[PDB]
Scaffold this motif. Structure first.
Motif, PDB file in Angstrom:
ATOM      1  N   UNK I  24     -20.767  53.319   1.650  1.00  0.00           N
ATOM      2  CA  UNK I  24     -21.420  53.517   0.358  1.00  0.00           C
ATOM      3  C   UNK I  24     -21.799  54.984   0.218  1.00  0.00           C
ATOM      4  N   UNK I  25     -21.354  55.624  -0.862  1.00  0.00           N
ATOM      5  CA  UNK I  25     -21.818  56.955  -1.228  1.00  0.00           C
ATOM      6  C   UNK I  25     -22.575  56.912  -2.540  1.00  0.00           C
ATOM      7  N   UNK I  26     -23.686  57.632  -2.592  1.00  0.00           N
ATOM      8  CA  UNK I  26     -24.454  57.792  -3.815  1.00  0.00           C
ATOM      9  C   UNK I  26     -23.983  59.026  -4.563  1.00  0.00           C
ATOM     10  N   UNK I  27     -23.539  58.832  -5.791  1.00  0.00           N
ATOM     11  CA  UNK I  27     -22.939  59.884  -6.593  1.00  0.00           C
ATOM     12  C   UNK I  27     -23.936  60.301  -7.659  1.00  0.00           C
ATOM     13  N   UNK I  28     -24.453  61.520  -7.578  1.00  0.00           N
ATOM     14  CA  UNK I  28     -25.256  62.052  -8.670  1.00  0.00           C
ATOM     15  C   UNK I  28     -24.320  62.797  -9.607  1.00  0.00           C
ATOM     16  N   UNK I  29     -24.078  62.228 -10.779  1.00  0.00           N
ATOM     17  CA  UNK I  29     -23.106  62.726 -11.734  1.00  0.00           C
ATOM     18  C   UNK I  29     -23.829  63.262 -12.958  1.00  0.00           C
ATOM     19  N   UNK I  30     -23.061  63.822 -13.882  1.00  0.00           N
ATOM     20  CA  UNK I  30     -23.625  64.422 -15.079  1.00  0.00           C
ATOM     21  C   UNK I  30     -22.563  64.411 -16.157  1.00  0.00           C
ATOM     22  N   UNK I  31     -22.979  64.131 -17.380  1.00  0.00           N
ATOM     23  CA  UNK I  31     -22.040  63.740 -18.410  1.00  0.00           C
ATOM     24  C   UNK I  31     -21.313  64.928 -19.019  1.00  0.00           C
ATOM     25  N   UNK I  32     -20.499  64.616 -20.019  1.00  0.00           N
ATOM     26  CA  UNK I  32     -19.739  65.585 -20.788  1.00  0.00           C
ATOM     27  C   UNK I  32     -20.124  65.574 -22.258  1.00  0.00           C
ATOM     28  N   UNK I  33     -20.185  64.400 -22.881  1.00  0.00           N
ATOM     29  CA  UNK I  33     -20.519  64.315 -24.296  1.00  0.00           C
ATOM     30  C   UNK I  33     -22.020  64.277 -24.538  1.00  0.00           C
ATOM     31  N   UNK I  34     -22.747  63.536 -23.725  1.00  0.00           N
ATOM     32  CA  UNK I  34     -24.150  63.296 -23.984  1.00  0.00           C
ATOM     33  C   UNK I  34     -25.016  64.084 -23.011  1.00  0.00           C
ATOM     34  N   UNK I  35     -26.318  63.856 -23.095  1.00  0.00           N
ATOM     35  CA  UNK I  35     -27.299  64.402 -22.175  1.00  0.00           C
ATOM     36  C   UNK I  35     -27.432  63.521 -20.930  1.00  0.00           C
ATOM     37  N   UNK I  36     -26.538  62.544 -20.767  1.00  0.00           N
ATOM     38  CA  UNK I  36     -26.657  61.552 -19.711  1.00  0.00           C
ATOM     39  C   UNK I  36     -26.481  62.175 -18.340  1.00  0.00           C
ATOM     40  N   UNK I  37     -27.191  61.622 -17.377  1.00  0.00           N
ATOM     41  CA  UNK I  37     -26.882  61.853 -15.988  1.00  0.00           C
ATOM     42  C   UNK I  37     -26.858  60.517 -15.273  1.00  0.00           C
ATOM     43  N   UNK I  38     -26.091  60.473 -14.206  1.00  0.00           N
ATOM     44  CA  UNK I  38     -25.794  59.242 -13.512  1.00  0.00           C
ATOM     45  C   UNK I  38     -26.220  59.383 -12.066  1.00  0.00           C
ATOM     46  N   UNK I  39     -26.773  58.318 -11.514  1.00  0.00           N
ATOM     47  CA  UNK I  39     -26.855  58.125 -10.076  1.00  0.00           C
ATOM     48  C   UNK I  39     -26.188  56.795  -9.796  1.00  0.00           C
ATOM     49  N   UNK I  40     -25.210  56.784  -8.900  1.00  0.00           N
ATOM     50  CA  UNK I  40     -24.362  55.612  -8.760  1.00  0.00           C
ATOM     51  C   UNK I  40     -23.976  55.403  -7.308  1.00  0.00           C
ATOM     52  N   UNK I  41     -24.157  54.187  -6.809  1.00  0.00           N
ATOM     53  CA  UNK I  41     -23.668  53.808  -5.490  1.00  0.00           C
ATOM     54  C   UNK I  41     -22.306  53.158  -5.649  1.00  0.00           C
ATOM     55  N   UNK I  42     -21.290  53.717  -5.000  1.00  0.00           N
ATOM     56  CA  UNK I  42     -19.958  53.137  -5.050  1.00  0.00           C
ATOM     57  C   UNK I  42     -19.532  52.756  -3.643  1.00  0.00           C
ATOM     58  N   UNK I  43     -18.562  51.854  -3.574  1.00  0.00           N
ATOM     59  CA  UNK I  43     -17.907  51.490  -2.326  1.00  0.00           C
ATOM     60  C   UNK I  43     -16.789  52.492  -2.085  1.00  0.00           C
TER      61      UNK I  43
END
Lengths: 146, 63, 49, 49, 79, 147, 49, 209, 149
Positions: I24-43
């Motif tokens: 499992x890696x935790x991905x701190x991401x950041x958007x392109x269109x919006x002000x969104x940011x993501x924190x996501x656990x993926x397999x």
RNA sequence: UAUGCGCAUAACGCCACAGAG
């Protein structure tokens, strides 16, 4: 961050001279007899209940406060701080409970001299004579309607 | 292991005897009495300590 | 001696056949349990139940 | 090497207050301070973690 | 007089009510409920307690010697 | 922590600055002339207006557990529990407006939940609390070493 | 040392049960507490209060 | 000396004023809040010179139900108090028809005079306090709960609610310090509001024996 | 449509708090269109993601555009067309909290939304004009796919 | 009271050692 006196030894009315330097409202002591003769018996009761908590709290043990309040309310029932030993059991109502605890021949001798009556309501006295104990499922009776 | 349903009784008190070689009973001692008083089960002490040790019938003059 | 057991429930105890064929209960005979007690009488003191 | 005593109640009164009062399910909390004292132990708290 | 104790049946009372009633059904007392194949008198006494069909009176003794009478029909049973 | 009484309130709030006027007398027996004037005013100058100072300086009522039996009177809970439920009511009232997905719970039915649970948590009559207290002092004492 | 203490405390405090008025009384009617534990509550059931 | 005996007399006056108010006697707010400078203004300083004499500090409080039962508080002059002084005090009480007094000694009484004070009838209820045990009001301590003496109508409904005898109720001694503070006769029941930690307040009852 | 959110994200950091759960890696991401940011656990065994990966993140309420039937029961035997046929890594989890900031002005341009995919957690933070379809105890499908540019 | 087939046999304490949890 207050500053606290701590004396090895007890004289409760000696510290009443110094009421302008010491907060005598919050005076505490280990001796339950000194508190019982200076502040009354209902203060000595809270001293008992706090001292047992301080004994068990050294070891990380938390006995619930209701047990301590019951033990201190029993040991201070008669207006004096009474031990839980064979000298505080002399006050008991039931001769058979006094016999089943300790020195059965001395309490038997006292019960025979005084002509003592046992009402057979103690848990020891109900089990000597083979009768159902009053606590628990024995506080009540069941009646069959006819 | 040992198990006692009925058997020999002490000739003074008419309670069961002790030992597994004599096929005797086990104690329901004082601390077991205390811990069963704390349950509030009074007929279970009456069971263990009167019906299953020594339930005798004496004769008294009621007067 | 006690031994562990996981495949009984938490409210259960495991009684051996050494003790189960020796510890008895005085069940009175009613008309709604006389088949069970009758099979138990036929089995006898060395066959469980 | 511990040993345990299994007393077997012989009356309906003793049975009925052993099912209701002294059952294992009712002894979940210790009377000392009301904290639980039935719970899983050694291998289970490793494999559940 | 007015009965001034708890309207609920305590846990010590349902043990002795079920004990007395299962001892009655251990004798050939008539069963007020329908036996669904039970052979244990405790289970029958629990069905009779749940169906409010036990007639026994609990006499709750107060510590002066006084009492007051409650049927199990007029006590609030819980789980 | 402070003291209450009818005459105490009448001398405290009302007739202090009145007797602060000069009197020019002596102590009769351990008492100031101002106190003697306030005793004179309390005795004669009041008639059924001391009922006002009597009722405005009455003692706090007893707790509900001593007045109303908690097994047969609903909401007769402890004072500590009533303080706790009032604090949690004030604190829970904020989360139903702030936090999202409200859960169809009200203030009064939450109070009724907690008060009925407090009523049902009482000791049943019959409970040998002395054996429990004895075995609760004695059993932890096995985990206490010596000196 | 821990056993004789518990024995003495048990042989004093054994008569104390909660009555039908909610008073913890000794076996002779002597009133020790007017509510049990100064609030009347049971220790295993105050845990989520 | 001075500036220390004035402090002691100020404290044991303030404490007996708080005592007389707690027993239910008419005491003003200024007489409770008397500072040490106001004590040096009302009574003198230099007790060794004798501007406050202990004869001069004798108060007479009166009770709030009726002014027929008023109470002296005597501060006797001699350190060790015998029967010769309390006979004089009872002769002062018999003139003004006083039924109750309170003697504040500075060393204890003789046991003969102690038995004398007990030996007076219901016509003269005399009590005694050491000066040292009046330097602080013990009822202001955090462990001492609030004690309320009960009328005989409240004791009747008490013993009727629990169906109870006075033999069964808990005891407080009559030589208990708070029973001596509130001046409670034997046979009276004392309502006690404990500052509980599990409950908020807890009402218990004790009988004076 | 039952699409609750749709954007193109870009992985700015991987495991910043440094906890390193296996698989499992935790991905701190950041958007392109919006002000969104993501924190996501993926397999990351079955679907590995590196730094600087650009992926298209869709959150839906159902996988079927022909009416949000919203079963929640899992048939592997259903070969009917899904949203998941156009994506590479699909999860399914419950929204366990949503929160923001408000002082008598509701949804004041910040609204976190914490979603748990059976233990693999996720917050999706940003302006609350894009976070409307989320509520607590709701079931959502994560549907992400790496964009090859 | 137990065993065996109403019948026959056997009907225990006190010390001291050792041990189990």
């Amino acid at each position: 961050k207050e500053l606290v006196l701590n004396t090895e030894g007890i004289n409760l009315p000696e510290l009443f001279k110094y009421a302008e330097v010491l907060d005598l409202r919050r005076l505490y002591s280990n001796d339950i007899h000194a508190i019982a003769n200076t502040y009354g018996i209902e203060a000595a009761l809270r001293v008992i209940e706090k001292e047992i908590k301080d004994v068990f709290a050294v070891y990380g043990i938390a006995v619930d406060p209701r047990h301590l309040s019951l033990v201190a309310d029993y040991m201070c029932f008669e207006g004096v701080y009474k031990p839980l030993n064979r000298f505080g059991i002399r006050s008991n109502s039931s001769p058979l409970q006094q016999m089943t605890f300790e020195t059965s021949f001395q309490f038997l001798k006292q019960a025979t001299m005084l002509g003592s009556h046992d009402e057979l309501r103690s848990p020891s006295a109900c089990l000597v004579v083979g009768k159902v104990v009053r606590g628990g499922t024995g506080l009540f009776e069941l009646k069959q309607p006819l | 292991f040992q198990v006692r349903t009925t058997g020999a009784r002490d000739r003074v008190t008419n309670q069961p005897i002790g030992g597994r070689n004599v096929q005797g009973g086990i104690r329901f001692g004082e601390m077991e009495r205390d811990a069963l008083l704390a349950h509030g089960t009074s007929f279970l002490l009456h069971d263990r300590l009167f019906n299953c040790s020594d339930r005798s019938v004496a004769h008294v003059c009621v007067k | 001696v006690i031994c562990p057991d996981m495949y009984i429930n938490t409210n259960e105890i495991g009684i051996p056949m050494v003790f189960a064929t020796k510890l008895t209960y005085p069940q009175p005979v009613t008309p709604w349990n006389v088949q069970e007690l009758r099979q138990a009488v036929i089995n006898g003191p060395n066959v469980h139940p | 090497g511990d040993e345990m005593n299994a007393h077997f109640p012989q009356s309906e009164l003793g049975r009925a207050e052993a099912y209701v009062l002294a059952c294992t399910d009712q002894q979940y909390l210790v009377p000392k301070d009301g904290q639980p004292l039935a719970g899983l132990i050694q291998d289970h708290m490793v494999s559940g973690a | 007089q007015k009965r001034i104790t708890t309207p609920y049946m305590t846990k010590y009372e349902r043990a002795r009510v079920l004990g007395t009633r299962a001892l009655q059904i251990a004798m050939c007392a008539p069963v007020m409920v329908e036996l669904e194949g039970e052979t244990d008198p405790l289970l029958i006494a629990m069905k009779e307690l749940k169906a409010r069909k036990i007639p026994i009176i609990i006499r709750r003794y107060l510590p002066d010697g006084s009492y007051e009478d409650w049927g199990v029909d007029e006590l609030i049973i819980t789980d | 922590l402070l003291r209450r009484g009818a005459f105490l309130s009448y001398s405290q709030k009302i007739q202090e600055a009145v007797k602060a006027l000069k009197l020019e007398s002596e102590n009769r027996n351990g008492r100031s002339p101002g106190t003697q004037e306030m005793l004179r005013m309390w005795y004669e100058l009041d008639e059924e207006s001391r009922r006002k100072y009597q009722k405005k300086a009455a003692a706090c009522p007893d707790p509900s557990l001593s007045v109303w039996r908690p097994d047969i009177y609903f909401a007769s809970v402890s004072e500590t529990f009533e303080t706790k439920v009032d604090d949690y009511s004030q604190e829970w009232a904020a989360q139903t407006e702030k936090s999202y997905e409200k859960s169809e719970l009200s203030l009064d039915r939450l109070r009724t939940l907690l008060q009925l649970k407090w009523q049902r948590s009482l000791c049943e009559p019959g409970e040998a609390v002395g054996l429990l207290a004895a075995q609760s002092i004695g059993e932890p004492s096995t985990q206490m070493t010596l000196n | 040392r821990s056993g004789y203490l518990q024995r003495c405390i048990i042989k004093h405090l054994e008569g104390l049960v909660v009555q039908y008025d909610l008073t913890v009384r000794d076996s002779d009617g002597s009133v020790v507490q007017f509510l049990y534990g100064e609030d009347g509550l049971d220790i295993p059931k105050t845990q989520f209060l | 000396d001075d500036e220390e005996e004035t402090y002691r007399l100020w404290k044991i006056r303030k404490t007996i004023m708080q005592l007389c108010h707690d027993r239910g006697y008419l005491v003003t707010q200024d007489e409770l809040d008397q500072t040490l400078e106001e004590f040096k203004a009302q009574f003198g300083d230099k007790p060794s010179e004798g501007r406050p004499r202990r004869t001069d500090l004798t108060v007479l409080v009166a009770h709030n139900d009726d002014p027929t039962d008023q109470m002296f508080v005597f501060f006797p002059e001699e350190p060790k108090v015998g029967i010769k002084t309390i006979k004089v005090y009872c002769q002062r009480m018999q003139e003004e028809n006083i039924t109750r007094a309170l003697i504040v000694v500075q060393q204890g009484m003789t046991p003969s005079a102690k038995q004398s004070l007990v030996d007076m009838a219901p016509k003269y209820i005399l009590e005694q306090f050491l000066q040292q045990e009046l330097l602080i009001n013990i009822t202001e301590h955090e462990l001492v709960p609030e004690h309320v003496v009960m009328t005989k109508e409240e004791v009747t409904e008490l013993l009727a609610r629990y169906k109870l005898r006075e033999n069964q109720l808990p005891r407080i001694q009559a030589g208990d310090p708070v029973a001596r503070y509130f001046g409670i006769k034997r046979g009276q029941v004392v309502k006690i509001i404990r500052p509980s930690e599990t409950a908020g307040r807890y009402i218990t009852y004790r009988l004076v024996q | 449509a039952g699409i609750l959110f749709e954007d193109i994200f870009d992985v700015k950091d991987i495991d910043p708090e440094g906890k390193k759960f296996d698989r499992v890696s935790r991905l701190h991401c950041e958007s392109e269109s919006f002000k969104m940011d993501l924190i996501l656990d993926v397999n990351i065994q079955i679907y590995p993601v590196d730094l600087g990966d650009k992926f298209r993140l869709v959150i839906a309420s159902t996988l079927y555009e022909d009416g949000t039937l919203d079963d929640g029961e899992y048939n592997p035997t259903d070969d009917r067309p899904s949203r998941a046929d156009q994506f590479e890594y699909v999860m399914y989890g419950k929204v366990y909290r949503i929160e923001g900031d408000e002082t008598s002005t509701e949804a004041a341009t910040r609204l976190s939304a914490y979603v748990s995919y059976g233990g693999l957690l996720m917050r999706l933070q940003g302006d609350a004009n894009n976070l409307h379809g989320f509520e607590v105890d709701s079931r959502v499908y994560l549907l992400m796919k790496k964009l090859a540019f």
